[PDB]
């Protein structure tokens, strides 16, 4: 019971682990997607002025 | 003209397009470390 007990407080550490890295992933990809199309904004109103 | 101003307008030529900015995320490979030599311990399988 010690043992299976050590076991699931590991399991319950990496889930953790793994539900932060796939949250920090989805807030890296929005900074990127919004930085392209801050880019693509700024080449654009280049050509209106 | 009687003045000396020209009758067929001048040339004015299309300027150069704002380009597209370019970078690049270019990436490296360091490998895997090699892995070490084991060494016998004295305490037994739960204990180490």
Excluded at chain 1, 18 to 47: F, P, V, Y
Excluded at chain 2, 9 to 37: K, R
């Amino acid at each position: 019971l010690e043992n299976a007990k050590w076991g699931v407080s590991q399991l319950i550490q990496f889930g953790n682990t793994l539900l932060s890295i796939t949250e920090r992933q989805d807030a890296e990809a929005l900074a990127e997607i919004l930085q392209t199309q801050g880019s693509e904004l700024a080449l654009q109103s280049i050509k209106m002025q | 003209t009687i003045d000396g101003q020209p009758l067929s307008l001048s040339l004015y030529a299309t300027p150069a397009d704002p380009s597209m900015l370019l970078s690049a995320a270019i990436t490296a490979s360091q490998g895997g470390g090699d892995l070490p030599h084991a060494v016998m311990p004295m305490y037994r399988f739960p204990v180490i």
